[PDB]
């Protein structure tokens, strides 16, 4: 019973931390940012 309660509490804490705008997913956002920056630079290079 104690182990079950501890596991449930840990899962609840994980949910609360994730939902409170923790900005934890930096690694997944970096890919999108870099790809978009590369494409925008490629397009903007046409003014030279």
């Amino acid at each position: 019973k104690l182990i079950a309660n501890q596991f449930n509490s840990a899962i609840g804490k994980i949910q609360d931390s994730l939902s409170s705008t923790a900005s934890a997913l930096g690694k997944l956002q970096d890919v999108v940012n870099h790809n978009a920056q590369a494409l925008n630079t490629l397009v903007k290079q046409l003014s030279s």
């Binding site: 397009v43 903007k44 046409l46 003014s47």
Partner: protein
Amino acid sequence: KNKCVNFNFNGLTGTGVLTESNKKFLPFQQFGRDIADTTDAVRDPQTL
């Protein structure tokens, strides 16, 4: 206006489709540029 045609505005030549625009050009403005310095808007020489 609404057909894919070649156009020549005061020696500025191009190919594309012409449509009526809502942009607010000032009296001393005649051209509109894009991120890649591509002409996007034009003032008609006669009908303004």
